[PDB]
């Protein structure tokens, strides 16, 4: 009966996946979805490796990009729950190597909270400050290094790329997406925890049963590793140039499968929703994080912009769209959290759709309720947020 | 046993089709192959219409381009066999509307034979004579209107586009591929036969059992008609702009399926090979064209260039590669004839691979022997000659 | 009957291949053999790609190394037959960019013949002249950059690596294997022919029917491309680090399959043996190279050393062992030519075993007679010369 | 139907075996698995003897190492059930030859229970106490003779190697893996039982139907005996030097096949699970050991470390991982027992995966339920625990 | 198995029926097909009566038009077999009421054979002889009353409409389709047989089991009688004006269902094919008509034109296309007989597709072999010949 009921939504999801794959022309794509904490459908299309004629499989491993930032935020929250990390203390307390910076001749300080929400003013890959300022001013008026090859031994050495770069804007003033901030966050994690960042992340993965997740390293052998392709100026499929992501481990230097992302999403959803089911049953296992911490996360922050959805705002390393209803019989906004990551030669997305719970459902139902959708692709510059949202809505509607 | 033996080559052909489709990113592709005058495999991949989710089928209808030129040449040969057409007589005898032209102040004349081999010097879509001359000179040194919307009532009116254009080169001097020459050939056919060109072509199709072949007209309903797509500057799939091909009926204004192309190729092969099996059996039916005419066709012409194969030369509206062997244990050139046609939003190819016959095979075998491969695609600027050649070679090798 | 007779030697060859694979521990290996100009056996063992579980196939593509030097020598001989190249003229005539060099304050000149036999004194990857001199002196007494990543646009720019390096020894005095000499030879070929080296090599491959042979480039897609593996300090299989071979195109920057190597060997054997069968039949096709040129090649040069066989001497870009018989009932030396190439993460070998022809065999036999053996492996530092010789001897013995 | 259902998991297990064999480069490997007390799959890969070209077979005999310790523990438990052995009595009661030892000038005693769990402080092959202490201290801070040739006539004489060696740590204080402790245990068994250790072990094997199990002796003929290989400094396969294991009979001086290990595991599982099925049926045969004794075994001991799995603890001569579940939707720990043994030139593993039984399954099912996996290899320093666990999980999932 | 095999062709036939119905816009359509003398599929689409919302059914009764002419020819053949009718005798022998006519002042006579093939020159509904002559002359050069309301008591009185009309052309000279000739034929039948035409036709229907066939009369009640519709000048569906067909009983004044037409076609096919199966079995029942008479029928007559198929010729009240094959691998003409009838407000078609029989099929097969297709529509001016031919070809191809 579970599969019999879940026989129409799977077809529509497969049709949407074919539609987006044909629209973008990607060689292959893998989709994985979990319903109420239980995986119900996993499928792959196309070829993981065009040269060797390797078909896509649910066990295929690809890049995840911003999922690394999400996991870094999870590690930061775990450290903060232990009291070893303090958010508003200036970063120079933990990392004296970072020099003190002044904006417009004024003494300013940057905190971990500003770094999480990309409000510290740390520059992005773009170097010309004038171009960035002009673009931001134009956007405001309208509203009113990537291919590096060097390998970095330690996270501290990675700071050399941007330690001397002056701040583009005043801290906590303007939203500016950046990735070096997460490198600084990884350095903070290493300093506070006293252990290597990779070891801590591996321990977290083992605790979360995310076995297949691992960093990007060329020398070690990694099974079911796929390839990445781009279209050239002649509209012909070519291979992605080889790059090194040793300095972007917290900012996108990770690989994983759909199952690990589904497990991570289910764990996050359980941690969020456990704080409400406690009054109904005391036999439920405690969540991975305290409910207060989960409420602190996924909370929209003012003056932040959600790039892949204009209706939402940037939460703590997440994109959250709040429930909204303004006029009668008009558009009803749904509550969901998602993050889109785009690396070179690949694209990915992870979406969480919590269920709306009344006072009667929680009486005789398990705490983890919702839909988790994960889609990974081996083509760069692909937007999969809308497709994931549509698939999640279809599954929610078809849930018997 | 026939299908059991033809179980390995089909898999390899399908793999090659998938490879080329993924390399070019075409939404859909259809393949049709005939062995020894009998169709053995037809298959389609992708979606004929992305918007309406229509899968590709062997009955799908797409543009054919240069197959129209091939059929026009067939009609010209049929008229010439009846004695109503004379090749070397100047075209002004049949079409007085075409003005006499002089090159470098010298009286020159153009014949149908020059028009067939693209040696008359008639300009192509390019208008600047200086650019064409510079390109041809550069090519020689190295060796050493499309989106028109107007509908044309009659073929005579189509001459207005290029009747006043001066000749780019001396007739019969330099090879220059052009399509208006075939419009002039269609006018010649209408004048000589005394009937409409479309009626004559329809009669030829009915004789050749090519029922699904028809010209491109928007108003009439045509079943299983597909769509055409292009990639924009943002590497996103878009729709092909609407165009009118009333003036390019002989030059690419036709639609057909794989089966009709296979039938046409089989008929041409039978007409070519009937002249040799006559001494073995007098019960064989006569070919559609006389063997002498078939020998006159498919004969390479000097000073002509085969664009899609540097090892061949342009025959009479065909691309023929002659059998060649120069050194021992070196490359052995195979004998085959093919023509590649590329229109807006679509691409197609038709290849004929005659079999090598000894004095013993013809004693107890039917006259039509060879492999015919036809591939049609709904993506512009695609080269399918190599894939068709590989598929034909695979079938020839696997022929039990 | 041909396969029935060739049923015992194939088993022994497969057993020897398994033995060497287990002895070295290579993940995969591919073998290809041709008898009397006709391929009789092709087989692959292991996995081409351990990560994606891709089994080895006869169509697998791997590095060839010194086969590139052999092909460069073939191109040089082809140019010399046309009279455009003169061996003993100093290289400064064709390449003025190379500065004149003096040894021990004496004016000396280097010729193409010295470069071919590695007698010009050009340094190898080793930089310390003292160590090289000490090693050579120790060897005489006993007898009595690789991981570069930069891409080079043109062959002329590749000379920057060693244009200012002083000569280690007097030209034509001591044998010293080197690869930059073949880069200089490629520059000479480009200067003399007036065309790009890659275009000339592609034309040669097309003439020789070596379609799958192509240079090493990461961006273009190459089907059936394999991977390369090395053993680390912990005796665990790891991946080979990514390297660029733009400056070693003539010195090992090429990829090919077993079939192309077999075709090249058969062509060379036919060119060698055609000069003797001419008196018996005038219907034989001329060889790819003149018999006098083939006799000039494969001729041992004094003061040269064959690294992989102490019983032979270095010919013109080949390793030739002459027929020898000194005492009665003692070891009888066979005549064969072979070249072993070893790149990073891969190893390969190509062996030619000419047949001994009497005055009676040539009366009623085809000119190309002999055994060609080709073995390619994806493990570095592997010696496959002995295995190839044993397989060739087994096939020669078992030839009914 | 049993084989039809067991058609997918076998393929995955074979693929994993190939993967690990290629990763380590072992010449050969043998796998044997039993499902619910019935053997379902046995297979061998590679060559048992590279020199004589002997392929691996399920009947191949190799070293087992720590399986000897497991069998010694089984014999000790059997003796203890008869009341002839007392655990907490000092060993000097049974073996007066062992001198009394004092730690830090304090009278201390060692018991059989301490010896079983490696808590007696008996030194390992390492002789320098300072190095061992430094290594243990470093490990604690981070957390916060082999090639002997002499033959020993009797187990008592084997004590001469370590009878005078002072204890490294206080008894029952720190975990320290050692093998001489099991030699002392064998001496205890000989003293208490009054018969030879080998005779008692042979009787146990005969009772357990482990016919092929036998000690390592060069003089007697043993059928299907394999060879052992190591990689040298030049990454070339070599032969293992000849060694004598007369003093390590309880510590690794035994040989067996996969079938005997499967039978032993099935017997242990039946003995463990018989104590629960008694209330459902009185017709079941009694287990080889009392259920209370089986519960006493496989019980994790505090302050012990499981070397091959950080998630488990060292039980009585076993490695047991307890079932664990801390957070919701997080990693769920499975309950299993396994032991990994590594000798010179060979490696082996034995894993037991008990099934989770509810109150309904035991009503109509046989007592022995679970999966037993045994893997033996002829390459030293190989970790096969993860592969065995994955194979067992695959079989459990695929169990129809 | 019969229905399982006949599961694909039915779908294609239904699709074609939907296609033609949508193309013409008919309110309803009914199809009936018989395979090898056994009905296999009957279906109706749309509404028989739009006003009363009556869906179309296989039992729906509609007009048949030229099927009345076919039945009249059958009756004439039956009378001729009895010797009571003589073809070449002038009609004045049987019907003295018809005056003798002279063409161009020359004595001419008309026979029943001329009337059957429409060669007697009797005028059609058109009255202006000049227009008819001009149209026929134009057609030759290119190649090189309906709404009457009066009721007629007897067939003799019906001759008053055209008894005084002069002949348009010389008898037996030019083909001219007409319906008054069949009225004269009905008068001939009444005179020769001595009984009423309606009684004879009713007896024939009873013999042929065509129960539902009956003439068009308003007063009597006829069950399942449908309605007829036409499109007005405003492209809106309207009702067909009431008309009387008392004088067109032999020329289209009849109603029937699909089953009766299928039975009639099966009887005709059996009568045609019985003459060949006689030598194989003497137990077969005699056909309704002698085989010689059936051969005389369905025989193309020179100087006759088949209006609905240019590839055929008009036989005796039938349209027969002969088997033809002129060139190799060209169009192969199939042998079939069909007749299309078009009345006011309705259209119908009946097609017979005989099977090709070899010397082996007739040994162990029943005489009636072939496909019968009948389609009736309630929209005027509809051509259903092509659809019926396609359906018959599909059934023939799909016949297991």
Residue numbers in the entry:
A (entry chain A), B (entry chain C), C (entry chain B), D (entry chain E), E (entry chain F): 99 to 242, 291 to 546
Relevant lines from the article:
To examine the molecular architecture of human LACTB, we purified near full-length LACTB (residues 97 to 547) lacking the N-terminal targeting sequence. A final cryoEM reconstruction of the LACTB filament was obtained at an overall resolution of 3.1 Å with an imposed helical symmetry. Further analysis of the structural data revealed that the basic building blocks of LACTB are dimers, which are stacked on each other and assembled into filaments with a helical twist of 48.25° and a rise of 21.63 Å. LACTB has a globular structure with approximate dimensions of 60 Å × 55 Å × 45 Å and consists of a five-stranded β-sheet core (β1, β2, β7, β8, and β9) surrounded by 2 short two-stranded antiparallel β-sheets (β3 - β4 and β5 - β6) and 10 α-helices (α1 - α10). Our 3.1 Å map also enabled the identification of the amino acid motifs (164SISK167, 323YST325, and 485HTG487) that contribute to the formation of the catalytic site, including the catalytic S164 residue, all of which are conserved across metazoan species. The LACTB filaments assemble as stacked antiparallel dimers, where the buried surface area between the two protomers (A and B) is approximately 945 Å2. The inspection of the inter-dimer interface shows that three assembly contacts between neighboring subunits (A and C, A and D, and B and D) bridge antiparallel LACTB homodimers and drive filament assembly.
In mitochondria, the serine beta-lactamase-like protein (LACTB), which is localized in mitochondrial IMS, functions as a tumor suppressor by regulating the PE biosynthetic pathway. Mammalian LACTB is localized in the mitochondrial intermembrane space (IMS), where it assembles into filaments to regulate the efficiency of essential metabolic processes.
